[model samples]
Target: NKASVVANQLIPINTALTLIMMKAEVVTPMGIPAEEIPNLVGMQVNRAVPLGTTLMPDMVKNYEDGTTSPGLK
Candidate 1:
């Protein structure tokens, strides 16, 4: 079907609002230092929703070629 009802538009909006609140808490006086804020945010976001990764074997193989094959090539 070309047309379907968008039933969950509010889900992401709610998630974003929650993230904003978390960001405020992360950068406030009770949070980690400014220099470490990025790392904290990254960890928090990863915990909430893990970011995807590419299977670029060459990048990884360059360092650990002795243990694995260069699948990207």
Candidate 2:
């Protein structure tokens, strides 16, 4: 099953940045129950720091073709 496969691969990576990214999607199809999708979708990344510095929040400047770019502010 795809869901099972994802869950099995949920083991956290070692790097701080990698772990933060992993935590955000911890309960994703690759982590916990598949039924948790709704909850995960509504979740926010409050902060994602790397090397002790916070990553700048990506600004949604424009949307096109279902894609978006961060406005350099």
Candidate 3:
């Protein structure tokens, strides 16, 4: 499970912008683990993430500034 894009947005490269516009709520399963929200709140997004996309720290291709989390394949 991961964070889902709630609306369309444009994010520039290398910008650590806040993703507050994206909404997550209880019930019906938003498809994203609750933990994923905190991870993506202030992270940078690469390229254009359109509607219906999942959010993951590694999934977004960001792995620097102490934001990377170790995982197994």
Candidate 4:
């Protein structure tokens, strides 16, 4: 399930693709833990990311098709 980072009770898939900017605060889960996620000031998510997911090199793609990183390319 996914959460808005504000409201309680998680939802199902595609909840991973939300607009989260740097310095943004989340209460619901605080879930991911900001300290764990990388600085996502200009990135966006279109795919479904699992819960407790981390920002890996290939996890998020915002460049080229699939926004894929060099590895996924």
Candidate 5:
């Protein structure tokens, strides 16, 4: 928990469960304390951003729009 935060693992955490979204078994749950975590927006994760890490504007938003799966969408 505290160790991961200090160690800086660059993990990604989803902000919420909406019309569509999903896990991330990171050190922290990305919620609690409120101020620490930033909300995620725009597009699903096509890449692994880890978990429990802080968020920056468009860090996940513009990852080249992510890769799409074939015959699934």
Candidate 6:
């Protein structure tokens, strides 16, 4: 999993790739908490992220790619 900082002011879908990932403590009122930062990492953004906003589960996506596939092959 991976977590990243908000862009200059706002972040657009897919554009967040250019940002850097960090493991800082999360500070939000109604969103994913610090404990879930690890889960939010490496995931794709589902919508536009505004500055000073917390990262929410619905705000991002957990694509079912080969990397995240279950170990059954």
Model 1 compared with the native: what TM-score? 0.17
Candidate 6, superposed: residue stretches over 4 Å from native: 1-9, 15-28, 63-73
Task: Write candidate 4's Cα lDDT for 31-50 as tens digits.
Answer: 33343234433444444444
Which candidate has the highest TM-score of all? Answer: 6
Better candidate by TM-score, 1 or 6: 6
Candidate 5 Cα outliers beyond 4 Å, as residue runs: 1-47, 62-73
- Cα error, residue 9 of model 3, in Å, equals 3.1
Q: What lDDT tens digits, residue by residue, belong to model 5 across residues 2-62?
A: 3221113443444322222322323443322222223332333333454343332233433
Q: Evaluate residue 2 in candidate 2 and report its C-alpha lDDT on the 0 to 100 scale.
A: 38
Model 4: lowest-lDDT 10 consecutive positions: 4-13
The weakest ten consecutive residues by lDDT in model 2 span 59-68
lDDT of each: 0.23, 0.27, 0.47, 0.36, 0.31, 0.47
What global local distance difference test value does model 4 have? Answer: 0.36
Q: Would you estimate the TM-scores of all the predictions?
A: 0.17, 0.21, 0.40, 0.27, 0.21, 0.46
Candidate 6 lDDT, 21-42, residue by residue in tens: 4323334343443443444455
TM-score of 4: 0.27
| lDDT (Cα, 0-100) at 14 in candidate 5 | 44
True-structure lDDT of candidate 1: 0.23
Look at candidate 3 and give me any clashing residue pairs: 2-32
Residue 59 of model 6 has an lDDT of 60
lDDT of 2 by residue, 1-73 (tens): 3321121222222222222232322322332333434333323333332322222223112211212243232
On residues 1-73, what C-alpha lDDT tens digit does candidate 3 reach at each position? Answer: 3444443354444556455545643333354444554555665666555544444343354543332344321
